[PDB]
Amino acid sequence: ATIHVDGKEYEVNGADNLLEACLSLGLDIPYFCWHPALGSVGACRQCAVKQYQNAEDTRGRLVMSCMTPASDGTFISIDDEEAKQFRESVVEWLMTNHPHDCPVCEEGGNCHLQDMTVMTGHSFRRYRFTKRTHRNQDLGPFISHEMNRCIACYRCVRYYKDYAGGTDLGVYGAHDNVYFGRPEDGTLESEFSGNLVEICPTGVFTDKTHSERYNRKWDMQFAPSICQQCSIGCNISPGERYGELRRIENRYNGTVNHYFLCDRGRFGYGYVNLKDRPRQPVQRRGDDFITLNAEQAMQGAADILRQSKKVIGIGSPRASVESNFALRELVGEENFYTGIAHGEQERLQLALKVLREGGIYTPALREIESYDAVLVLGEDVTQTGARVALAVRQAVKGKAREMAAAQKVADWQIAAILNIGQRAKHPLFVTNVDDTRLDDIAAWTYRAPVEDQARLGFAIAHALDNSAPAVDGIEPELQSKIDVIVQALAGAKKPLIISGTNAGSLEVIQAAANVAKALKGRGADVGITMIARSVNSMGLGIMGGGSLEEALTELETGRADAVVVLENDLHRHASATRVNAALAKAPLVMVVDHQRTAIMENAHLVLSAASFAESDGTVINNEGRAQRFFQVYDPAYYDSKTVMLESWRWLHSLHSTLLSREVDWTQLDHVIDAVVAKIPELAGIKDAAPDATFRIRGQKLAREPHRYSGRTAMRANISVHEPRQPQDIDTMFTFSMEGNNQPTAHRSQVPFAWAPGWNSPQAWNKFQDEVGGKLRFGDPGVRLFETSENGLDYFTSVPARFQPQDGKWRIAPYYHLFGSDELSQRAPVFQSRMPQPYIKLNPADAAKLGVNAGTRVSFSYDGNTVTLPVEIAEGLTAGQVGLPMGMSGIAPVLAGAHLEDLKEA
Amino acid sequence: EPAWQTRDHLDDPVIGELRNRFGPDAFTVQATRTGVPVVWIKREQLLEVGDFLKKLPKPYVMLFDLHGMDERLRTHREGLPAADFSVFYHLISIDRNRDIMLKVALAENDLHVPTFTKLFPNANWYERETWDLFGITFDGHPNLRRIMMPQTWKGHPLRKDYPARATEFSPFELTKAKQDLEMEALTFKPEEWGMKRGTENEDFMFLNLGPNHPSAHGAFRIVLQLDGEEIVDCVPDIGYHHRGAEKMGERQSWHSYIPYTDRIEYLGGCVNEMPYVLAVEKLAGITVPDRVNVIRVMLSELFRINSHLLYISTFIQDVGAMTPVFFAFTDRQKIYDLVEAITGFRMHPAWFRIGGVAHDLPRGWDRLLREFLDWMPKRLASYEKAALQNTILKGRSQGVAAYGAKEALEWGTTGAGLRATGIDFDVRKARPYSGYENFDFEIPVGGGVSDCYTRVMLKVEELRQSLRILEQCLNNMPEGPFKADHPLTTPPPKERTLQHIETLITHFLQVSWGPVMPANESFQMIEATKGINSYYLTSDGSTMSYRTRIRTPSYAHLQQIPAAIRGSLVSDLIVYLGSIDFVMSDVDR
Amino acid sequence: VACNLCAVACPVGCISLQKAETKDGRWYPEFFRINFSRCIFCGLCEEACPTTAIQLTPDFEMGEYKRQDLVYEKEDLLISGPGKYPEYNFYRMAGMAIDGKDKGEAENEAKPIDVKSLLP
Amino acid sequence: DYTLTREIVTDPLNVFMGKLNDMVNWGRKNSIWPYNFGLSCCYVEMVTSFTAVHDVARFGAEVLRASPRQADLMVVAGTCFTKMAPVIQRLYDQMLEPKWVISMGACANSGGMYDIYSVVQGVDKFIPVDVYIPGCPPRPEAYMQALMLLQESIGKERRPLSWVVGDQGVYRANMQSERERKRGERIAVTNLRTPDEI
Ligand SMILES: CCCCCCCCCCCCCCCCCC(=O)OC[C@H](COP(=O)(O)OCCN)OC(=O)CCCCCCCCCCCCCCCCC
Ligand SMILES: C/C=C(/C)[C@H](O)[C@H](C)/C=C(C)\C=C/C/C(C)=C\Cc1[nH]c(OC)c(OC)c(=O)c1C
Ligand code: SF4
Ligand code: SF4
Ligand code: SF4
Ligand code: SF4
Ligand code: SF4
Ligand code: SF4
Ligand code: FES
Ligand SMILES: [Ca+2]
């Protein structure tokens, strides 16, 4: 298509609306109600441009550029006097009832309404009458509500209902008394409610966690990091001030996590600001805990390691690729083991074998929204990999999108799509041990034990292809349900099979692989997705290594007097008594970590590591994409005693002092080249991000905006002399504003979005080649492995039907978005959103042993009697006991494990 | 037609002459808000175009400016030739009362330009500064060494890939440079400074004037080669007052850079604030009301009287009389009382704003202005009678370091040094600005020879004319706003900020991020207290300045210093330094 | 109200503060330090203050012995009265509810109307 | 409380020797000879203080010698540039005991607004400073106030009377800071004049 804006010719996509077409060319049009991810509604009447019918016209017509298609040969004007006067009048109308709240508002400096007020050139007030006011609700611990600042642009309701699928936020009221919120007080129960602080162009919904320790956007120091709370790896912008992490913002990635995060990633960051963190290397002498510097601890650890006879290593999925590799180089390959259990490791290796050998393409997070049918096997996606569930919601709405597109309705006309697609949607079949959060849009929900889920998967695979292993003993109504599922999946053009390691069974993943292979044999465009548990589970799986149980046996025997444990507390993957015995019998226990764990009361040496806010590294997401995260700030800037170093730096310096007795704080690119040369499978992280020699026309990349304030007074309480700027030898970013953050810079990593005149999160428009699409010059992150040219065979190991037996209560895992991740539940703000750990029983089992709701019932696991209160779960099957993984005293390793000694307390 | 509109200046005759001579493909005309025709010219034809401009019927006799620019970061270069660096030449034709800009584009690797010192002898220091600050080599230059930074300075500071803030301090480097200073005074080599005849006559003694200097000009060095008392040759050594004001212009917003504009010439104050805020108003498209113009003229004339009083008193003290410096500083205290009442500060008020001034005039300023205008003229006549008519002062000052109009034009000397040659070129009358047309004042001119005494008497007459302007301003003050009605007026009026929310939004985004100037180029040239000051500003569309170029006249005067003092005495050099009216902040900056 | 505008309007960057909030909802600075060894006394902070909190008194006697003692904390800057502006109160203009000032009690603000009210 | 340079000690000051030390410090504080050092703006305000409308001569500080040997007090009245930092160091080293340093302006105090590549951030990076004055520029009466502060510091110190008999050790007085001393009256200010008046 061809457009002519203000007498200038441009080439745009013909299926885009006029607003996004003009925004992709760098032209400025004010807008409130339009969002690239939500569509167009024509509410705010702010995007007005004067459209002419042909080349030679003078009258024109004021049209909504968000509602006007960018067809071929479209003549429009933005800077016409009538259009500019109308836009200024719309801003003035929005400013009649707006409170005088900008200094005391958390959106000041980040406010879209402020930028659109300045850009339209409206600065003189003539409205002299009273301004309407509204009471403010309580929306929970994360979202702070201020309805006075609203402009009634309907972005919140559209996102929260059409996109996020939430049910407890809506628009009420009348002519000018519109109220956007819950019908009463209470917490927004949606798992993606945190995106309201960026969707809302004003200060109605604000980050209350940020609002507690509040600073302005120009005072923040940002870094482009990867979220460290689950396996999806949504790119984020941590921004700090005064040496503490202040706010996690969403960082645009057109391939993974474009405009939205989940609540766990956005608000699970309070563990960085904890006061009980290890900040120095600490060595215990008897009962005293003395503090060493870097060199003293390095020499002492080198001496004690050298006096030992054999050393073993225990990595973690919470650590980066480089840190686990540095540990592995410190101990040796043959003496290296992972920090996960044997069953967890076997499930992880099976998932990886399906991923990079099964020959079936695993899509990225954005590409999930294009599949025409979704089958989820066992994994509770909303509680573990929530953003994948959001993409599944988009893929379900794809059927209504296709039905609207059949009637020549454009993609941005979201109202017409929702009107045509009333309730018809793409098939979603979820299987879980209880009621999934996706059941509102699910075409079918299967509540059954995990063995029955795997049996269902193998039955689906046998109904798809005759060569799959059959399943005998299927009820006729369940068989009719398989007929429904196979009729949905066979007719689907892009079927999708999602499962995960959190399901806790090898046979579920095997059944998913068999269904995918049977779909592949029919020529379908089947995609397959494995969800992992932690941030770098795929990295630890790809690097391989022994399980934790071998390390525990090896330590409890006594062959090695020297163990290293990195970024682990060992209670999420092993029992507490066994870990305590293994770490008390061992005379030399080294632990490298950044959080105060339980095993530091009996560990020989503990080195204060650096978290993602203070360390660089590379992590692998569940899809298989290496992503490089950077350091946000230097802890030594605000306190010189703070020795918080990178974990791979710690281990590399210790190995250097072990061999050559020389302290070596290496660079990150040396470790990158080490993992490329040593590991051919991890060779793909070389081009995940460019090295520290990368320059945009000679200058580095700036971590903070150009209006960074308080430079000569933020440290004046300690000393009036300004210290040296912290040199970043590790990467291409500088720890100051002496750098480059231009939207047109030839780079992929972007710390923060800021254009002149665009201070809002809408400044991400200038950083993309087309708005709502990919990032300009490509998106950061590269695929480690490609699609294989053959695949795996059908797995014959069909499990038997679950048998409810007395005494042996099989534990059904009930993961949560708040309370199933280690670092997330370490945060103090999550403690109010975190529900009480409630043990869930069937009505039949509770009647059998004599339980009503709320009574405290105790069970013994590994000789430890813990007491939890009972909630009656209807969707759970009899013979199972639902337990929340990750709570206080409960481990995620208990998924799929039977439980003994259950009577009422 | 607004006076800030983006004109192309294709109706200029000089574009027609250039197209007739070099053809219509050899150059590209760039439309700017600078008010001058900007012509992008191929590097190979630079000397030909310069000689052609010098050989016009009304030639471009003066090289006003010459400096580089790093265009690697400039995103908005629509219509501009493909460049990694650029070198601009600002040439003023006095006879046409016009000026042209020539921009030579440069690749990242081939950073060499033909020298311009053959056509214009004052191009030497500008090319040395361009080589020092940008790393651009000039082929054919006699002595291409650093002029703003010491010779052992790695990198080039005005490049975009150079860090602006202060680096780590080290006393070891201090001791190393102390050692360099100590062996420089003992093992001086008059060869790297471009001097010849290194005491070849067995009597050419070598003297160092600075770097410590017990006067208000500031710290600077002159290395004199002497035959008895005659100055055979002298090499000025400047850079001892370099604050990096342009690099700070690349680091501050349009609002917060005004205090840095104050300290360019610290005897000027509001006169220094005026061209910068006028150029930013050109960039923002702001036309200030009449009351703003009269207020800014009032403060600029007051600071001009202050600077002229300090200059006359310091010259008289350099001759040898002592009492007039005490009396003139009492008069400066009267001026400072009025300025303290108006703004709230003495030396650097920081009171002008983009689109107006900071506050309004206080209730009762006319009484203080009337008191000052009654206090001045009797004391000024007393100063003339007591010191400026003394025949010992006349013998010291008359005929010392004299030059004609050709030497003033070829060295770029402006102000009293140009008007003592009889060239009636004042910016306030030739290219008027800020409502100077509404006032009636005379422009004093000399007989045609620039003595020290002639320059001092011209500054005395300029003081009297500034008193006349202040009398006219006191008798005629318009009633109106002290800030414009433009949305880019930074800051907005305070009471509307305190009780309106749109004004609060404008204030919030203008004091925090800065005002967003649309991407253009502006240039303002005014007559400062010591000559011609000018700000050339390039905006890339951001809230900071992509390029801030500050042309100051004491640079050209200090470059003219060896041309007029050769063959004279050292006391004549002292009197000449006292009569230039320069400060080292104005030279180095 | 600890709105951080004076710290960013400062070209020297010699103002450092941090916003804290009481239980009623009002905003105050947790601390407020001005490095007077760095300050150039340009008055941009007073011009940028939307509450007229920070002001510049006619007082010049600030010479010190130690440069560290030129760092004036919040207890060294907070005076007893209103200074040069004797009647302006920002929270009477602001729309946020604080102690002694409910919604609709600000200047030119109507009383809040609930959506459940019986009026059409 | 006192400071030694040749540490934190007590007041060491017999009653006749103390009386002669008091007269020596009185004669030293009542005659201070500053060095004529012209760097920047703050020097112009210093010579404003020296003139007749201000008359710093009343304190016996109108000498303003051009040689470092004759002058006692070094007033760093301007920015410390990277080229002039060895010059300032050499001029300070060419002085004679007793020597006092007064840093006029935010430039000499901390570098001021010029956090730039070619500016030393304060003269206290490489020379000791007796009295700092804030202001850009400090007014001439602020320079006189710092002069009386220097006189008060001189009148309390105990320099060695002779180089042949006595403790050859510099005894500077740890004076109470002006901020804590004037906090009793600066906070008590309630109402100031409105800026609309003159
Ligand atoms: C214990 C009591 C003692 C106290 C002191 C009392 C006596 C003070 C005597 C001071 C003597 C100062 C002598 C200065 C001589 C200067 C001669 C000279 O050459 O001056 C230069 C000036 C111009 O020279 P020319 O060559 O013409 O210049 C052309 C080139 N441009 O040439 C000229 O301007 C020409 C005129 C030169 C000066 C003529 C004589 C003046 C004498 C001083 C004034 C005395 C007033 C009465 C004092 C009290 C008496 C009781
Ligand atoms: C008893 C023995 C002694 C040494 C006495 O203490 C005094 C000091 C002797 C004399 C002779 C008095 C005064 C002359 C003088 C040393 C300076 C005046 C001055 N003052 C300035 O400022 C006010 C200047 O402007 C920069 C100056 O140029 C000049 C020249
Ligand atoms: S609360 Fe925010 S997102 Fe919702 S309509 Fe109002 S301004 Fe728009
Ligand atoms: S939402 Fe925006 S316009 Fe409204 S008070 Fe907050 S910063 Fe000001
Ligand atoms: S889905 Fe996972 S990676 Fe993404 S924001 Fe949530 S916790 Fe972080
Ligand atoms: S007066 Fe001082 S503290 Fe205020 S903005 Fe200016 S330099 Fe900063
Ligand atoms: S003093 Fe004024 S400008 Fe500074 S934070 Fe407080 S209210 Fe804002
Ligand atoms: S502190 Fe200010 S007035 Fe003093 S020298 Fe520095 S810039 Fe000039
Ligand atoms: S953006 Fe088009 S009307 Fe809202
Ligand atoms: Ca780092």
Counting DSSP H helices and E strands in chain B, the numbers are 20, 15
DSSP class of A162: I
- CB neighbour burial string for A863-875, b if at least 16 within 10 angstroms, e if fewer: eeeeebebebbeb
Q: Does C75 touch chain D (CB under 8 A)?
A: yes
Of A490, A501, A502, A425, nearest to A461 (Cα)? A490
C36 touching chain D per CB within 8 A: yes
Q: DSSP letter string over A461-492?
A: HHHH-TTSPP-----HHHHHHHHHHHHHHHH-
Looking from the CA of residue B400, the nearest atom of ligand 1 is 31
| Strand-pair category, C15-21 with B547-551 | unpaired
Closest CA to D158 of D173, D144, D143: D173
Verify whether the Cβ–Cβ distance B164 to D116 is below 8 Å: yes
Q: Give me the residues of B, 517-556, that contact A with CB < 8 A.
A: 541-544
Contact D105, D77 (CB under 8 A): yes
Which backbone phi and psi does D172 adopt, to 5 degrees? -90, 150
- How far is residue B181's CA from residue B240's CA, in Å, rounded to a whole number? 13
Contact B261, D102 (CB under 8 A): no
- Residue B547: DSSP 8-state: E
CATH architecture of C1-93: 2-Layer Sandwich (3.30)
Residues of C in contact with A180 (CB under 8 A): none
Determine whether the interchain pair B218/D38 forms a contact, defined as Cβ–Cβ distance below 8 Å: yes
Closest CA to A249 of A270, A281, A224: A224
Ligand 10 ion: residues within 5 Å (CB): A 616, 631, 730
- State both tokens at D2: 């006192």
A668 close to A692: Cβ distance less than 8 angstroms: yes
Residues 6+ apart with CB under 8 A from A78: A5, A6, A22, A27, A28, A29, A49
Contact between C68 and A719 under an 8 Å Cβ cutoff? The reply is: yes
Contact A188, A168 (CB under 8 A): yes
Residue B187: CB atoms within 10 A of its CB come to 7
Sign (positive or negative) of CA dihedral A823, A829, A831, A832:
negative
Q: Nearest 5°: phi and psi at C104? A: 90, -5
DSSP per-residue codes, A831-874: HHHSPP--EEE-HHHHHHHT--TT-EEEEEETTEEEEEEEEE-S
| Contacting residues for D161 by C-beta, under 8 A, at least 6 apart | D17, D20, D21, D24
Say whether residue C81 is in contact with chain D using an 8 A CB cutoff: yes
Structure tokens at A257: 């996590």
d(CA A132, CA A121): 24
Q: Give me the sign of the Cα torsion angle A783, A784, A788, A793.
A: negative
Neighbours of A832 (CB within 10 A): 12
Based on its alpha-carbon atoms, the radius of gyration of chain B, rounded to whole angstroms, reads 24
Exposure string of B503-516, with b = 16+ CB inside 10 Å and e = fewer, is bbbbbbbbbbbbbb
Distance C37 CA to ligand 8 centre (A): 12
Distance in Å, CA B573 to ligand 1 centroid: 23
Backbone angles phi, psi at D133, to 5 degrees: -125, 120
One-letter amino acid identity for A775? L
Helix-strand-coil split of chain B, %, nearest 5: 40, 15, 45
Is there a contact between D102 and D67 (Cβ–Cβ < 8 Å)? no
DSSP A573-599: TS-HHHHHHHHHH-SEEEEEESS--GG
Measured CA to CA, the distance from residue A296 to residue A280 in angstroms comes to 12
Inter-chain contact B161–A218, Cβ cutoff 8 Å? no
Q: Rounded to whole angstroms, how far apart are CA atoms A443 and A457?
A: 16
Q: Which CATH architecture has domain D2-187?
A: 3-Layer(aba) Sandwich (3.40)
Q: Which of A177, A712, A738 to mutate to test the interface with C (most CBs of C within 10 A)?
A: A712
Q: Is D78 in the pocket of ligand 8 (CB under 6 A)?
A: yes
How many other C-beta atoms lie within 10 A of the C-beta of residue B207?
12
Angstrom CA distances, D80 to A112, A228, A549, B577, C7, stand at 44, 48, 66, 23, 25
Looking from the CA of A149 toward its CB, the CA atoms found within 13 Å total 29
Cα–Cα distance, A672 to A656 (Å, whole number): 17
Distance CA A814, CA A282 (A): 37
Kindly list the partner chains of chain B, i.e. chains with 3 or more CB atom pairs below 8 Å: A, C, D
Classify residue D174 as exposed, middle or buried by CB count within 10 Å of its CB (0-12, 13-18, 19+).
middle
CATH topology for B245-588 is: Cytochrome-c3 Hydrogenase; chain B (1.10.645)
Give dist(CA B514, CA D63) in Å, integer.
Answer: 48
Angstrom distance (rounded) from CA B161 to CA A657 = 37
Measured distance CA(B556)–CA(B579) in Å, rounded = 14
What single letter denotes the amino acid at residue A814?
A: Y
- C-alpha torsion A699→A703→A706→A708, nearest 10: -140
Burial status of residue A788 (CB atoms within 10 A of its CB: 0-12, 13-18, 19 or more) = middle
DSSP state at residue B289: -
Rounded distance between C-alpha atoms, residue A51 and residue A60, angstroms:
5
Phi-psi region of B4 (alpha: psi -120 to 50; beta: other; left: phi over 0): alpha
And the tokens for B440?
């009636």
For A259-386, strand residue ranges (E) read: 282-285, 288-291, 311-314, 336-337, 373-377
B361/C contact by beta carbon, under 8 A: no
d(CA A554, CA A582): 9
Resolution in Å, one decimal, please.
Answer: 3.2
**3-state SS record for chain C:** CCCCHHHHHCCCCCEEEEEEECCCCCEEEEEEEEECCCCCCCCHHHHHCCCCCCCCCCCCCCCECCHHHHEECHHHCCCCCCECCCCCCHHHCCCCCECCECCCCCCCECCCCCCCCCCC
How far apart CA B515 and CA B535 sit, in angstroms, is 18
Find tokens 């009649």 and name the residue: A96
The conformation of residue B388, written as its DSSP 8-state character, comes to: I
> Would you give the distance in Å from CA A227 to the centre of its chain?
5
Query: What is the number of the ligand closest to the CA of D111?
Result: 8
Binary contact (C80, D189; C-beta < 8 A): yes
Query: What are the boundaries of each domain within chain B?
Result: 13-139, 245-588
Q: How far apart are CA A411 and CA A741, in angstroms?
A: 32
Q: Is B585 on the interface with D (CB under 8 A)?
A: yes
Cα A213 from Cα A240, distance rounded (Å): 10
Give CA–CA dist B312/B318, Å, rounded. 10
Amino acid at A577: T
Cβ atoms of A408 and A532 within 8 Å: the answer is no
If DSSP codes are grouped into helix, strand and coil, which group holds residue A6?
Answer: coil
Q: How far apart, in whole angstroms, are the C-alpha atoms of residue B427 and residue A265?
A: 62
From the list A863, A812, A831, A126, the residue with the least C-alpha distance to A447 is: A812
Tell me if the bond preceding B515 is cis, omega within 30° of 0: no
| Strand pairing category for A495-500 and A527-531 | parallel
CA dist A72 and A62 (Å) reads: 19
Radius of gyration of chain D measured on its C-alpha atoms: 18
C-alpha dist (Å) from residue B148 to B151, B211, B235, D83, D117: 9, 15, 14, 10, 12
Tokens of C70: 């030129």
Chain C residues closer than 8 Å to D141 by CB: 60
Q: Which residues of D7-35 are buried (b: 16+ CB within 10 A; e: fewer)?
A: eeeeeeeeeeeeeebeebbeebbeebebb
CB D54 less than 6 A from any atom of ligand 2:
no
Can you give A792-842 as a three-state secondary structure string?
Answer: CCCCCCCCCCCCCCCCCEEEEECCCCCCCCHHHHHCCCHHHHCCCCCEEEC
Cα A328 to Cα A319: distance, rounded to the nearest angstrom: 13
Which chains have 3+ CB pairs within 8 A of C?
A, B, D
Residue that the structure tokens 């939004």 belong to: B505
Cis-peptide, bond into residue B81, ω within 30° of zero: no
| Pocket of ligand 1 from Cβ distances under 6 Å | B 391-392, 395, 398-399
CB-based burial label for A793 (10 Å; 0-12, 13-18, 19+):
exposed
Residues 6+ apart with CB under 8 A from B173: none
DSSP assignment of B119-187 equals T-TTHHHHHHHHHHHH--EEET-S----SSS-SS--S-TTSTTS--S-----HHHHHHHHHHHHHHHHS
Nearest ligand to the CA of B569 is: 1
DSSP helix/strand/coil, A11: strand
In b/e form, how buried is each residue of A401-432, taking b as 16+ CB within 10 angstroms?
Answer: bebbeeeebbebbbbebbebbeeebbbbbbbb
Could you tell me the CA-to-CA distances from B221 to A870, B147, B238, B241, B577 in Å, in that order? Answer: 89, 12, 6, 11, 12
- Cα angle vertex B142, ends B137, B143, to 5°? 75
Count of other CB atoms within 10 angstroms of residue B447: 10
Name the pairing type of β-strands A373-377 and A428-432: parallel
| Window B:169-198, CB contacts with D under 8 Å | 169, 171, 174, 177-178, 180-181
Pairing assessment for the beta strands A143-145 and A617-620 based on DSSP bridges:
unpaired
Ordered strands of the B62-70 beta sheet: B27-30, B38-41, B98-106, B85-93, B62-70
Compare all CA atoms of chain A with the CA of C38 and give the residue at the minimum distance.
Answer: A712
Q: How far apart, in whole angstroms, are the C-alpha atoms of residue A876 and residue A898? A: 15
Amino acid B57 reads: P
Q: Nearest to residue A399, comparing CAs of A370, A419, A367?
A: A370
Nearest CB to B487 within list A121, A707, A724: A121
- Which residues have a Cβ under 8 Å from the Cβ of B33 and sit 6 or more positions away? B4, B5, B6, B7, B282, B283, B520, B521, B522, B523
Q: How far apart are CA C58 and CA D194, in angstroms?
A: 11
> For chain A, which chains pass the contact test of at least 3 CB pairs under 8 Å?
B, C, D
Helix axes D85-93, B171-186, angle to 10 degrees: 80
Place of tokens 């310096």: A653
- Report phi then psi at A424, rounded to 5: -70, 135
Is residue A125 a contact partner of residue A95, using CB atoms and an 8 Å limit? yes
Distance CA B312, CA B95 (A): 31
| Chain CA centroid to CA B158, Å | 18
What is the four-CA torsion angle of A6, A12, A18, A19, rounded to 10 degrees? Answer: -90
- Which pair of tokens denotes residue B460? 């005395």
Using a CB–CB cutoff of 8 Å, tell me whether D33 touches chain B: no
For residues B313 and B316, give the distance between their C-alpha atoms in angstroms, rounded to a whole number. 5
Q: How far is the CA of A232 from the centre of ligand 5 (A)?
A: 6
Using CA atoms, how far apart are residues B456 and A527, in angstroms rounded to an integer?
88
Structure tokens at A460: 């689906």
Alpha-carbon B234 to chain mean position: 24
Could you tell me the sign of the dihedral formed by the alpha carbons of A529, A535, A539, A540, in that order? negative
Phi, psi of A864 (to 5 degrees): -125, 110
User: Mapping DSSP to helix (H, G, I), strand (E, B) and coil, where does residue A52 land?
Assistant: strand
For residues A569 and A587, what is the distance between their CA atoms, to the nearest angstrom? 18
Length of chain B: 589
With beta carbons under 8 A apart, name residues in chain D contacting C67. Answer: 109-110, 122, 124, 129, 132
Residue with CA nearest ligand 6 atom 8: C10
For tokens 């002399």, the residue is A721
Residues paired with residue D104 on neighbouring β-strands, in sequence order: D77, D133
In whole angstroms, give the CA distance from residue D129 to residue D133.
11
Pocket lining for ligand 5, CB < 6 angstroms: A 227, 229-230, 232-234, 261-262, 264-265, 385-387
Q: Return the CATH architecture of domain B13-139.
A: 2-Layer Sandwich (3.30)
Cis-peptide into C86, omega within 30 deg: no
Distance of CA B13 to the CA centre of its chain: 28
Cβ proximity of B523 and B9 under 8 Å: no
Between helix A548-557 and helix A576-585 the angle, nearest 10°, is: 50
Residues 6+ apart with CB under 8 A from A106: A144, A203, A206, A207, A210, A211, A214
- A91/B502 Cα distance (integer angstroms): 9
Chain A to chain D Cβ contacts (< 8 Å)? 8
Q: What is the CA radius of gyration of chain A?
A: 28
Phi first, then psi: give them for residue A785, nearest 5 degrees: -130, 150
Q: How was this structure determined?
A: cryo-EM
Distance between D118 CA and the closest CA of chain A, angstroms:
16
The phi, psi pair for C84, rounded to 5°, reads -80, -20
Quick one: tokens of A507? Answer: 């046979």
Expressed in angstroms and rounded, the spacing between residue C8 Cα and the centre of ligand 6 is: 10
Q: What is the CA radius of gyration of chain C?
A: 18
Contact state of C48 with B252 under an 8 Å Cβ cutoff: no
Asked if B359 reaches chain D (Cβ–Cβ under 8 Å), the answer is: yes
Question: Which class does domain A809-899 fall in?
Answer: mainly beta
The H or E element that residue D185 is part of is helix D178-186
